[PDB]
Structure formats: structure tokens, C-alpha cells
């Protein structure tokens, strides 16, 4: 987390058909689910995979940065770790903070 | 090289 | 497929004893998507599933069946960040072709005109969209017949089934 | 919410440069300060706005969908409506259902 | 403009580079336009001069 360059998308809607990419065919199949009359997705008939073409009329998600006010915390000192409290690495993975 | 299956 | 009857108590070893009588060569359904999951995030850009094969085919020659096995390894290891190189991408396939290797057991031009040709296929798609004319129509509608064919060819096959071959014949 | 059509993104990286589109400035910048070496962002002398072109190595979102098993539910008869017990529209807005 | 566009991807050529490095240079003018600016201020023309 950077309050500095905070992560977040923005929709746009593509202008003009993009260029086709390589995709699974399960993965090329949810993204037809989705765009229907604004995507094809076709077999590449030697590799078994899909070619994924976005139409014109799309909606795409585009990452963009935005700068935040709160710069500072009350954090727990840096280097603190339930491992050497002597807490498990299962526990540590499996619980939240 | 000698093709083998998955085990 | 095939749920041996204590899954939860059979141990490793004598669970892939059952699991090899019946099964050949098949990456399976939950392993195939395992790994084009890992390809997708975890690849650089442009780098496929296919590219990773035409790479552990010829710097390190593996058949369908072996790279198979790369793969699987590659997919237990998988990174926990995207690889930025290309040529980091193929450092990761070394390593884990490796790793297959002593898992298994076994020791280890034209390219100008495909430059060329890119570019002639772009100016036909610049050129098909100047002039407005969609080039995959055809595969459309014959993916939407070859779809009402099998349903056709569904009901038929089942009248067949009850009216049998002497009666509908 | 549709059970049976998912909504999700999935990450892919742009193989080759997207085609520019139009943005405001505010805009354009958050894009550039996301994005750095993989976009450019340029005035449009005539209008002030700027153009923004993607390139190539960039990520984007491009959503997909996701057919779900949970089907069905034990929902409050459909038209309740908080407004028919007597609920004032700015509590409506204002507050979760 | 197409034709363009996709020929000089061919020709791996930046066709936006000249304002890229200009729009860098713009920036370190205003920069040390700036420290001068003030110094001036600071010092005053007579002396600067």
C-alpha cells in the first residue's frame, strides 16, 4: 500500500477492435460469456487454444494511480513477526494479521 | 528425445 | 474420475497405485487449467503456454508427454510475482526442466520473413477495416450450423435409440 | 447480481501498443502515474485535453464471466419496499438495505 | 495514419520521441528559470546585473 500511487481502474470502452491474444479455451469461453456480441474467440486448430479478439463497443479496465492525503500510521515496529513470538507458519498463512 | 507420459 | 474408497486415509504412494491402472497420459481437467492459470499470471508478456513448449522443445528437447512433466514442476513452484524478461521466463523453464530431470531420472532465418509477414497481415487488417468487411463471418455462421447439426443429429440419434435401426429404416 | 454470469477481470499484458484515446488532463496523468515507462501521455494543443496510448508491456483488465452452482435463495417478497412502511427516500439512500 | 502507425512499428521506429525528450527539457527550464528567478529576487537587478 503506497497512499502516494493508490491502485484502482477506470472503464473504458475500446474505440476501435484490439488485437487478438493467445487464451485458454476455458478461459477464452468466460470471456465470450461476458462480452457476447463484442468479442470472438476462435480454436486454434494445431495448439487446441483460443484467440481472443476484443470488438469495437468492449468495455476494458484501464489501471491508474491517484495521490493520498494520509501519509502516516501508528504501525507495529518494523520487523515484528509472530514467527518469533513462535507462532506456527500454517497458523501465519492461514489466519489474517 | 524418448517421449514419456505423466506418472 | 475414479474416487478410490478412503480417499482421506490411503495413503500417497498407494493412492497413485490405484490412479495409474486407469489413467494415460492425460494432463487432466483440474491440472489443465492448473497450468494455464500459471502461464497467464505468472508468464511476461506474449509468453503462452505454446511458446513454452516451442522453448522446452528446442533448447532442451522435450516431446508432448515430457514437457508435460516440466510443467507439472513448474506448477509447484510457481512464482509469486510475474517474470519481467522474456529471457527470465526462460531461465524459470531451466531450472524446472531441471528439477523434472532428475525427478524422472534423464541428463540434458526464417525468423526474418516471420518479421516480414507480421507486417503484411497488419495491412490487410488496416485495409479490411477501411473497407468495412468482416473477415471472420464465415467461421460464425459456420460455428452456429455445426452446432445445430449435433443438436439435429441428437434427436435423431435418439429415435434410433427407442425405434431402433429395422423400424426407422 | 446474476448467479449463472459472474462478473470478474482477469490481468493480461498488452503485447503490442493499444491505440490511442481521448482523456482529460486530471485523467491522463493518473494514467501516467500508474503506467511510466509503458504509456505515453500527450496535450492536445487545440482542445487541452490529452491522448493516451498504451504501450506495449502494460497491463490491462480485461473482464470475463463466471457461471456459478448457488442458484437460489430465501429473498424478502419481491417489491418490499422500505418506502411502503413508511421510510423517508434520504434514509433509503443514505443507509444499507 | 494507419499505414503509417503500423509501418513504423515495422520499421521499429519512435515516432514520439522528439517530444518526449522536448518536454524534458521544458521542464528543467522552468527549473533553473527558477532558481535565477530567485536569486534575483534575493539579490535585485543592480546587483545581478
Given at each position: 500500500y503506497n497512499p502516494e500511487k493508490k491502485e484502482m481502474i477506470q472503464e473504458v470502452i475500446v474505440e476501435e477492435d484490439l488485437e487478438p491474444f493467445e487464451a485458454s479455451k476455458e478461459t477464452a469461453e468466460q470471456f465470450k460469456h461476458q462480452h457476447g456480441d463484442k468479442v470472438d474467440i476462435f480454436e486454434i486448430p494445431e495448439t487446441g487454444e483460443y484467440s481472443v479478439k476484443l470488438l469495437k463497443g468492449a468495455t476494458l479496465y484501464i489501471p491508474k494511480a491517484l495521490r493520498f492525503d494520509r501519509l502516516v500510521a501508528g504501525q507495529?515496529?518494523?520487523?515484528?513477526?509472530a514467527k518469533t513470538y513462535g507462532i506456527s507458519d500454517d497458523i501465519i498463512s492461514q489466519v489474517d494479521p | 528425445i524418448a517421449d514419456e507420459p505423466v506418472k | 474420475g475414479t474416487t478410490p474408497e478412503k480417499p482421506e486415509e490411503t495413503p500417497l504412494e498407494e493412492l497413485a497405485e490405484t490412479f495409474q491402472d486407469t489413467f494415460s497420459g492425460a494432463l487432466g481437467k483440474q491440472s489443465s487449467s492448473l497450468l494455464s492459470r500459471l502461464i497467464s499470471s505468472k508468464?511476461?508478456?506474449?509468453?503462452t503456454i505454446t511458446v513454452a513448449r516451442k522453448y522446452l522443445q528446442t533448447?532442451?528437447?522435450?516431446?508432448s508427454g515430457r514437457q508435460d512433466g516440466v510443467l507439472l514442476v513448474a506448477l509447484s513452484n510457481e512464482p509469486a510475482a510475474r517474470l519481467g524478461s522474456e529471457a527470465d521466463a526462460k531461465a524459470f523453464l531451466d531450472s524446472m526442466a531441471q528439477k523434472y530431470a532428475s525427478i524422472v531420472g534423464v541428463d540434458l532465418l526464417e525468423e526474418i520473413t516471420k518479421d516480414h509477414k507480421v507486417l503484411a497481415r497488419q495491412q490487410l487488417q488496416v485495409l479490411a477495416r477501411y473497407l468495412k468487411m468482416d473477415l471472420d463471418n464465415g467461421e460464425r455462421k459456420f460455428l452456429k450450423e455445426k452446432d445445430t447439426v449435433a443438436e439435429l443429429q441428437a434427436q435423431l440419434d435418439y429415435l434410433n435409440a427407442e425405434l431402433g435401426e429395422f423400424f426407422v429404416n
Open positions: 507495529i515496529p518494523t520487523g515484528w513477526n | - | 508468464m511476461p508478456g506474449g509468453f533448447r532442451w528437447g522435450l516431446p
